[PDB]
Swiss-Prot record, chain A:
Function field: Component of the membrane attack complex (MAC), a multiprotein complex activated by the complement cascade, which inserts into a target cell membrane and forms a pore, leading to target cell membrane rupture and cell lysis. The MAC is initiated by proteolytic cleavage of C5 into complement C5b in response to the classical, alternative, lectin and GZMK complement pathways. The complement pathways consist in a cascade of proteins that leads to phagocytosis and breakdown of pathogens and signaling that strengthens the adaptive immune system.
High-level lineage: Eukaryota, Metazoa, Chordata, Craniata, Vertebrata
Cell location: Secreted; Target cell membrane
Stated family: Belongs to the complement C6/C7/C8/C9 family.
Protein name in the entry: Complement component C8 beta chain
Source organism: Homo sapiens
Subunit structure: Heterotrimer of 3 chains: alpha (C8A), beta (C8B) and gamma (C8G); the alpha and gamma chains are disulfide bonded. Component of the membrane attack complex (MAC), composed of complement C5b, C6, C7, C8A, C8B, C8G and multiple copies of the pore-forming subunit C9.
Residues of the full protein shown: 348 to 396 of 591
Membrane spanning residue stretches: 32-39, 45-49
Disease connection: Complement component 8 deficiency, 2: A rare defect of the complement classical pathway associated with susceptibility to severe recurrent infections, predominantly by Neisseria gonorrhoeae or Neisseria meningitidis.
Post-translational modification: N-glycosylated; contains one or two bound glycans. Not O-glycosylated.
Curated annotation (Swiss-Prot), chain B:
Regions that span the bilayer: 16-24, 27-34
UniProt disease link: Complement component 8 deficiency, 1: A rare defect of the complement classical pathway associated with susceptibility to severe recurrent infections, predominantly by Neisseria gonorrhoeae or Neisseria meningitidis.
Family in the record: Belongs to the complement C6/C7/C8/C9 family.
Role: Component of the membrane attack complex (MAC), a multiprotein complex activated by the complement cascade, which inserts into a target cell membrane and forms a pore, leading to target cell membrane rupture and cell lysis. The MAC is initiated by proteolytic cleavage of C5 into complement C5b in response to the classical, alternative, lectin and GZMK complement pathways. The complement pathways consist in a cascade of proteins that leads to phagocytosis and breakdown of pathogens and signaling that strengthens the adaptive immune system.
Gene of this entry: C8A
Origin species: Homo sapiens (Human)
Assembly description: Heterotrimer of 3 chains: alpha (C8A), beta (C8B) and gamma (C8G); the alpha and gamma chains are disulfide bonded. Component of the membrane attack complex (MAC), composed of complement C5b, C6, C7, C8A, C8B, C8G and multiple copies of the pore-forming subunit C9.
Name of the protein in question: Complement component C8 alpha chain
Residues of the full protein shown: 233 to 282 of 584
Locations listed in the record: Secreted; Target cell membrane
Superkingdom of origin organism: Eukaryota
Length: 49, 50
């Protein structure tokens, strides 16, 4: 028989990572314009609107 | 660790006006018409979670 003994050691490591990203944008512009003018003159009646 | 965020804003604007002028002459006459309108809308919403 041999007299040696036992000496041991161990180590374990772990790591995890995660990232999430979400972005959105919406922009709508609406513009409407009109111009209407009428003219009437006779001689006697005058019409305008 | 978790993070949640949401911030939204809404804006709306509208305006219109009508003007009418009618007058017969020949006995001069005058008629005036004025119309005005304006509309504004604003919305704000913000959410945050951790």
């Amino acid at each position: 028989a041999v007299l040696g003994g036992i000496y041991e050691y161990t180590l374990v490591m772990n790591k995890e990572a995660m990232e999430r990203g979400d972005y959105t944008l919406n922009n709508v512009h609406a513009c409407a314009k009109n111009d209407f003018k009428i003219g009437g003159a006779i001689e006697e009646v005058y019409v305008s609107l | 660790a978790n993070d949640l965020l949401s911030k939204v804003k809404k804006d709306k604007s509208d305006s219109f006006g009508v003007t009418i002028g009618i007058g017969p002459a020949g006995s001069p006459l005058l008629v005036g018409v004025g119309v005005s309108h304006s509309q504004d809308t604003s919305f704000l919403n913000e959410l945050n979670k951790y």
